[PDB]
């Protein structure tokens, strides 16, 4: 401070079929996202894009971790090794592989995601929670 080496700045659902924007600003009030949701139409393809800056020194072993809950119950955990990054002017963007929102009535509904961004020193660069609501339609 007042500028940290690593600043997680944004999560984005990258979905071509989506009629509007699916972005969380992570420079803001993280607690708000929990009474919010992103809506996705069942079966659509998307990526998660995590935006982050490195401002001074090399960070090794950066790692994005998600846990998915449904109705408060853990249903999944995924890890993505992001890499080593040096400092530069522009944010870096990490994209997860393409996935499909679930499909079928029994899989529709809300899911909450606990997201963590970390490194090989186990620094908590940011942790945040958000929600995903799978619907029949937009």
Short mmCIF file of C-alpha atoms in Angstrom, two decimals:
data_model
loop_
_atom_site.label_atom_id
_atom_site.label_comp_id
_atom_site.label_asym_id
_atom_site.label_seq_id
_atom_site.Cartn_x
_atom_site.Cartn_y
_atom_site.Cartn_z
CA UNK A 1 0.00 0.00 0.00
CA UNK A 2 -1.04 2.47 -1.06
CA UNK A 3 -0.38 0.22 -4.28
CA UNK A 4 -0.01 -3.59 -3.59
CA UNK A 5 2.16 -5.74 -5.79
CA UNK A 6 -0.92 -7.88 -6.78
CA UNK A 7 -4.39 -6.44 -7.22
CA UNK A 8 -7.21 -8.69 -8.38
CA UNK A 9 -9.47 -6.36 -10.38
CA UNK A 10 -12.30 -8.19 -12.17
CA UNK A 11 -14.14 -11.53 -12.77
CA UNK A 12 -16.11 -11.79 -16.09
CA UNK A 13 -18.35 -14.50 -17.41
CA UNK A 14 -17.34 -14.62 -21.06
CA UNK A 15 -20.48 -15.74 -22.86
CA UNK A 16 -21.17 -14.74 -26.53
CA UNK A 17 -24.94 -15.61 -26.16
CA UNK A 18 -25.48 -13.31 -23.18
CA UNK A 19 -27.51 -10.20 -23.93
CA UNK A 20 -25.78 -8.19 -21.24
CA UNK A 21 -22.61 -7.77 -19.27
CA UNK A 22 -21.42 -10.38 -16.68
CA UNK A 23 -18.69 -8.59 -14.75
CA UNK A 24 -17.80 -8.25 -11.11
CA UNK A 25 -15.56 -5.27 -10.21
CA UNK A 26 -13.38 -6.72 -7.44
CA UNK A 27 -11.89 -3.24 -6.50
CA UNK A 28 -15.29 -2.61 -4.92
CA UNK A 29 -17.49 -3.91 -2.03
CA UNK A 30 -17.12 -7.67 -2.26
CA UNK A 31 -19.99 -8.36 0.17
CA UNK A 32 -22.61 -7.02 -2.37
CA UNK A 33 -22.11 -9.88 -4.85
CA UNK A 34 -23.79 -12.30 -2.43
CA UNK A 35 -27.30 -10.75 -2.79
CA UNK A 36 -26.51 -10.58 -6.56
CA UNK A 37 -26.46 -13.13 -9.28
CA UNK A 38 -25.42 -13.71 -12.79
CA UNK A 39 -28.07 -15.38 -14.86
CA UNK A 40 -27.03 -17.90 -17.45
CA UNK A 41 -29.31 -19.79 -19.82
CA UNK A 42 -28.99 -23.48 -19.31
CA UNK A 43 -26.43 -25.23 -21.59
CA UNK A 44 -24.62 -22.06 -22.80
CA UNK A 45 -20.88 -22.04 -23.14
CA UNK A 46 -18.79 -19.63 -21.11
CA UNK A 47 -15.36 -18.82 -19.69
CA UNK A 48 -14.39 -17.26 -16.40
CA UNK A 49 -11.95 -14.45 -16.91
CA UNK A 50 -9.96 -13.25 -13.87
CA UNK A 51 -8.25 -9.85 -14.29
CA UNK A 52 -5.25 -9.01 -12.11
CA UNK A 53 -2.33 -6.55 -12.12
CA UNK A 54 1.22 -7.06 -10.99
CA UNK A 55 2.76 -3.73 -10.02
CA UNK A 56 6.31 -4.25 -8.72
CA UNK A 57 7.80 -7.69 -8.56
CA UNK A 58 7.57 -11.14 -9.83
CA UNK A 59 4.80 -13.40 -8.38
CA UNK A 60 5.29 -17.08 -8.79
CA UNK A 61 2.78 -19.84 -8.71
CA UNK A 62 -0.41 -17.90 -8.95
CA UNK A 63 -3.48 -20.05 -8.64
CA UNK A 64 -7.25 -19.49 -9.00
CA UNK A 65 -9.45 -21.73 -6.83
CA UNK A 66 -13.25 -22.09 -7.03
CA UNK A 67 -15.63 -24.00 -4.81
CA UNK A 68 -19.27 -24.37 -5.98
CA UNK A 69 -22.15 -24.73 -3.58
CA UNK A 70 -25.82 -25.38 -4.20
CA UNK A 71 -28.04 -24.44 -1.37
CA UNK A 72 -25.11 -24.07 0.99
CA UNK A 73 -23.68 -27.55 0.16
CA UNK A 74 -20.33 -27.96 -1.43
CA UNK A 75 -20.73 -29.69 -4.78
CA UNK A 76 -17.41 -28.97 -6.51
CA UNK A 77 -13.84 -27.63 -6.19
CA UNK A 78 -11.63 -26.66 -9.21
CA UNK A 79 -8.02 -25.32 -9.36
CA UNK A 80 -6.34 -23.52 -12.14
CA UNK A 81 -2.65 -22.92 -12.20
CA UNK A 82 -2.22 -19.43 -13.63
CA UNK A 83 1.55 -18.99 -13.60
CA UNK A 84 4.43 -16.65 -12.88
CA UNK A 85 3.98 -13.03 -13.80
CA UNK A 86 6.14 -9.99 -13.67
CA UNK A 87 5.02 -6.44 -13.30
CA UNK A 88 3.56 -4.52 -16.22
CA UNK A 89 1.27 -1.56 -16.95
CA UNK A 90 -1.76 -3.46 -18.21
CA UNK A 91 -3.82 -5.97 -16.29
CA UNK A 92 -3.27 -9.60 -16.99
CA UNK A 93 -6.30 -11.77 -17.88
CA UNK A 94 -6.62 -15.48 -17.01
CA UNK A 95 -9.34 -17.47 -18.78
CA UNK A 96 -10.58 -20.81 -17.59
CA UNK A 97 -11.34 -23.47 -20.24
CA UNK A 98 -14.73 -23.25 -21.94
CA UNK A 99 -17.59 -24.83 -19.94
CA UNK A 100 -21.38 -25.27 -20.27
CA UNK A 101 -23.91 -24.09 -17.81
CA UNK A 102 -25.88 -27.11 -16.61
CA UNK A 103 -28.95 -28.14 -18.49
CA UNK A 104 -32.19 -29.79 -17.47
CA UNK A 105 -34.86 -28.71 -14.96
CA UNK A 106 -33.40 -30.72 -12.12
CA UNK A 107 -30.03 -28.80 -12.49
CA UNK A 108 -31.56 -25.33 -12.83
CA UNK A 109 -31.41 -22.83 -9.97
CA UNK A 110 -28.84 -20.84 -7.99
CA UNK A 111 -25.28 -21.88 -7.19
CA UNK A 112 -22.76 -19.88 -5.20
CA UNK A 113 -19.11 -19.72 -5.87
CA UNK A 114 -16.36 -19.05 -3.41
CA UNK A 115 -13.34 -17.86 -5.39
CA UNK A 116 -9.79 -17.44 -4.17
CA UNK A 117 -6.73 -16.03 -5.95
CA UNK A 118 -3.42 -17.17 -4.47
CA UNK A 119 0.27 -17.80 -5.09
CA UNK A 120 2.93 -20.31 -4.04
CA UNK A 121 3.51 -18.29 -0.85
CA UNK A 122 -0.24 -18.88 0.00
CA UNK A 123 -0.94 -15.13 -0.04
CA UNK A 124 -4.59 -14.29 -0.11
CA UNK A 125 -4.52 -11.88 -2.98
CA UNK A 126 -8.30 -11.95 -2.93
CA UNK A 127 -11.08 -14.05 -1.88
CA UNK A 128 -14.69 -13.38 -2.86
CA UNK A 129 -18.08 -15.01 -3.21
CA UNK A 130 -20.63 -14.71 -5.93
CA UNK A 131 -23.69 -16.39 -7.44
CA UNK A 132 -24.75 -17.95 -10.67
CA UNK A 133 -28.53 -18.67 -11.45
CA UNK A 134 -29.19 -21.12 -14.28
CA UNK A 135 -32.51 -20.46 -15.98
CA UNK A 136 -34.53 -21.92 -18.90
CA UNK A 137 -34.12 -18.54 -20.67
CA UNK A 138 -32.53 -15.11 -20.42
#
